[PDB]
A paper describes a structure:
In vertebrates and some invertebrates, members of the SR gene family are hormone-activated transcription factors, which regulate developmental, reproductive, and physiological processes. The protein's ligand-binding domain (LBD) serves as an allosteric switch controlled by the hormone, which binds in an internal hydrophobic cavity deep in the protein's LBD; ligand binding shifts the domain's thermodynamic equilibrium from the inactive conformation when ligand is absent to the active conformation when ligand is bound. In the active conformation, AF-H packs against the body of the protein, contributing to the assembly of a new surface that attracts coactivator proteins that alter chromatin or otherwise potentiate transcription of nearby target genes. In contrast to vertebrate SRs, mollusks contain a single SR ortholog that is unique in being a ligand-independent constitutive transcriptional activator.
To understand the mechanisms by which constitutive activity evolved in the Crassostrea gigas ER (CgER), we used X-ray crystallography to determine the three-dimensional structure of its LBD at a resolution of 2.6 Å in the absence of any added ligands. The domain is in the classic active conformation, and the backbone conformation is similar to that of the human ERα (1.36 Å RMSD for all atoms). Unlike other SRs previously studied, there is no electron density of a ligand in the interior of the CgER LBD. Rather, the internal cavity where ligand binds in other steroid receptors is occupied in CgER by several bulky hydrophobic side-chains, including F425 and F525, and – to a lesser extent – F524 (using human ERα numbering to facilitate comparison). These hydrophobic residues would strongly clash with estradiol as it is oriented in the human ERα LBD. The resulting cavity has a total volume (168±8 Å3) much smaller than that of human ERα (402 Å3) and too small to accommodate estradiol (245 Å3) and other steroids. First, it indicates that CgER is an authentically ligand-independent transcriptional activator, which exists in the active conformation in the absence of ligand or other apparent modifications. Second, the presence in the protein interior of bulky residues that occlude the ligand cavity provides a physical rationale for the inability of mollusk ERs to bind or be activated by ligands. Examination of the CgER structure suggests that the historical substitutions confer constitutive activity not by filling the ligand cavity per se but by stabilizing the active conformation in the absence of ligand enough to remove allosteric control. Replacing leu with the much bulkier Phe fills this cavity and acts as a sort of linchpin that improves packing of these helices against each other, presumably stabilizing the active conformation and providing a structural explanation for this mutation's potentiating effect on activation by the receptor.
Author numbering:
A (entry chain B): 248 to 474
B (entry chain A): 248 to 473
């Protein structure tokens, strides 16, 4: 049920990670990005562990479990960050409590178009009074909506999508009763997260290629899963 | 209300255009792309014209009107092509009646990734038994959701989103009564259209830059907006 899904997603809630960024050295492009890149990798390991808790997911084929993650990992990172950043009303993005970056920083690391979209999404979440339970459902949704093409596990993914859709609708009724515009408006945010994700991955691929910023192999395999 | 919005969106909504593609010549990459490219410029003219019928739009600043189209034109094209192709159930894309492309062709023009995503979306529309009125609302929604950053006409764009959101919910009740999953599942298709749109625009810019396939001025400028 909606209730069972939510309990599951909630006892698997991602913890918040510190960046342990060294603020003792000034924020060069390289300095910030190495913290951002590896904050990403730690949150990445967590997502993977978290995904296996999304009800139905461990019943997909291994290849498709990996595939879903390969499609949407960056979206999940950005989606989370947006929610972490809800209090800043679009003024900054909180990648970690340890690492809040404003538009100024975004320019330094040359990820302005990306973070400007995310930050705006953050503001929309704030404006739509999004509850944690709704966000939990949203990430699960981002995951199961990762690939639109037909996979071997098509059936099971369909079943998960249907269950998630019901849970989102019921959860919206709980925290925002009789508001028919809410779920659609919030789902519309996902289109921006998707756009941000795509640009995100493209940027990280070119970071990888510039070889200055160091990637560990987990993040690096994710990048090489595209092209 | 829902109805008056719907009457408006219907006015000058994209028609079927023939590409007048010449099948007498081999379906090379260049030959196909010249048809797709010229088909695109013609549909773009329709889009520009259609947009002005989306209620509220002509009240946006001129600047924001241009910006919205610049953001989402490609998504609008693919969304339409998906809806034109709904009968082919994901097997091929009917860019025009005279220009229907299956998976084999997509390879020739090296747009496999894009069209596979569009074709899959098409199958989803078919499976959700999507009605035209719904597609009309979807197009308008694609347009007014184009940019999430704050524009000068933020206030008015927001009003437009709200009224469209109402009309979408009512139109869903009419054609798919009491189905709580219909609207959400359908809106989720928009994320895939966005990804394909983004890839489309990239593909076309690299086409423009390799100077072999020829772009008109309308198309060349939309591309130079990114």
């Amino acid at each position: 049920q909606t209730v069972t899904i939510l309990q599951a997603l909630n006892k698997a809630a991602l913890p918040v990670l510190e960046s342990h960024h060294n603020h003792g050295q000034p924020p060069t492009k390289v300095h910030l990005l190495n913290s951002l890149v590896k904050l990403a990798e730690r949150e990445l390991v967590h997502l993977i562990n978290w995904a296996k808790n999304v009800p139905g997911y461990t019943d997909l084929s291994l290849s498709d479990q990996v595939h879903l993650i390969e499609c949407c990992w960056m979206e999940l990172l950005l989606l989370n960050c947006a929610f972490r950043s809800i209090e800043h009303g679009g003024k900054s993005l909180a990648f970690a409590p340890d690492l809040v970056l404003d538009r100024s920083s975004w320019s330094t690391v040359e990820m302005t178009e990306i973070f400007e979209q995310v930050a705006a999404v953050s503001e929309q979440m704030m404006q739509n009074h999004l509850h944690k339970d709704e966000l939990l459902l949203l990430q699960a949704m981002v995951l199961v909506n990762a690939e639109v093409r037909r996979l071997a596990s098509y059936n099971q993914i369909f079943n998960m999508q249907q269950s998630l859709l019901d849970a989102i609708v019921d959860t919206a009724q709980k925290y925002h009763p009789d508001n028919v515009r809410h779920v659609p408006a919030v789902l519309l945010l996902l289109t921006h997260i998707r756009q941000a994700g795509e640009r995100g991955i493209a940027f990280f691929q070119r970071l990888k290629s510039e070889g200055v910023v160091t990637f560990c192999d987990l993040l690096k395999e994710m990048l090489d899963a595209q092209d």
